[PDB]
Symmetry: C3
Subunit: 183 residues, 3 copies
């Protein structure tokens, strides 16, 4: 069992420094006087690990195998399908946007199909028909849906990959506007 | 003639072998194999009690780890600018709809035509259930303050969310007087 | 203030190595010629920290206290209830799946109860009754629900911890299929 002992005066720096040619290249240890931070530092790369009082720190992005923890707190890895976490989250989970957007307004009587400005499949929508009220519906895929909307009822179709909205038939309940919840 | 250089330290593989720095007789830091019969390699500040260790299947720091200014905390939380300067747990809670599979009653009473009531939560963009006739729940998802309609059990109810989601008004109903509102938990 | 100074020619390796005969145990420093990467490496464990030009990297999973950042970008910690983050996220937030599954089909007239393939509590469901249309409903817990579904109306019950679906009564609106939004 062996120890290579480095000794300095109280509170004075002590580190191991490597120089290649004329160039300071890396060092490890206690780089400054009156300071107990211990550092492993590449002078050439300017890349550094420091052991500090209440935490350890690297001054650049940090990889774990090929995974990346970025200096902005983002994470990239195969678990996130190779995406950055922020994009994986956006794509995987329903946004708590608490906001809505009009995708069409006008008038769509029985048999009338209209174009809407977003893919309305698996969306929260509200359809205004009679009496200036909003009728909630959540759609699935392209298909035929029914709502007992203000005025009577509306049987409607989502088609064209969510970009078509058609009034199949209604009773006294003609759609004149559609909101969708923001994603 | 120039070669790679090695400072070779020769020692029994099964015994501790490390470089120790002392300032004024005080153990300050060390690097290397700190214990006998243990191949873990450590970079350790005695003064700070802060440590990096290379173990068999992982590397480990014993305190919060900063990447630039971002922080990976010992509880697995992450703070950084990408999360708006929030901790990830809070960014997530604020950004995505909770799969709470739970609900809470926010009003009980009886609100006939023209009657408005105050509810204990902001009912905007919420999953709600209104009980009217026949002891059944009628689902609705609200948008902002506004006028809504549901052909609720009994007939129908035209209602208003107002006062920044804190007011619920029965505009008109046909045999369908609301007496309870549940909200899905956030 | 002291320095153990290591010197080599320009762009030649310089490192400190601990060994026992031909069994290398660990090294610290610039392990390669013409390469400024600085390394702390256990030969025995094959576990390594490297300071590179644009990042620092460990070659295995990285622990922060007891928390783990895995090489796939996943994260485990007490903040995630002891779960891996991917599981915490799946359990905690509603999936933006945009897809549905059939959980039952048949015919369930007044008073008829059926068993369904999934727990239908707090789910987005669509019930097909009359006129080949889907009627949206979002359920809460086991309980009694009402929808003015295509054909007239349907008062239905979710029971048996989400695995029972019962038509309590309907007017001309007999359920014949139920879809549920994928979790």
């Amino acid at each position: 069992g062996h120890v290579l002992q480095l000794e300095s005066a109280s509170d004075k720096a002590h580190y191991i420094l490597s120089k290649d040619g004329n160039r300071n290249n890396w060092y490890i240890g206690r780089g400054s006087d009156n300071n107990n931070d211990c550092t492993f530092h590449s002078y050439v790369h300017g890349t550094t690990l420091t052991l500090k009082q209440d935490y350890a720190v690297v001054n650049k992005h940090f990889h774990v195998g090929q995974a990346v923890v970025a200096t902005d707190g983002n994470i990239q890895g195969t678990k996130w399908g190779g995406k950055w976490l922020d994009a994986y989250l956006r794509d995987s989970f329903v946004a708590k946007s608490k906001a809505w957007t009009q995708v069409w307004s006008g008038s769509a009587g029985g048999g009338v199909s209209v174009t809407v400005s977003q893919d309305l499949r698996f969306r929260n929508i509200w359809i205004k028909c009679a009496n200036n009220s909003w009728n909630f519906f959540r759609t699935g895929p392209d298909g035929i849906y029914f709502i007992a909307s203000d005025g009577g009822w509306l049987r409607f179709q989502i088609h064209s990959n969510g970009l078509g909205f058609k009034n199949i038939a209604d009773s006294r309940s003609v759609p004149n506007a559609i909101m969708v919840e923001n994603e």
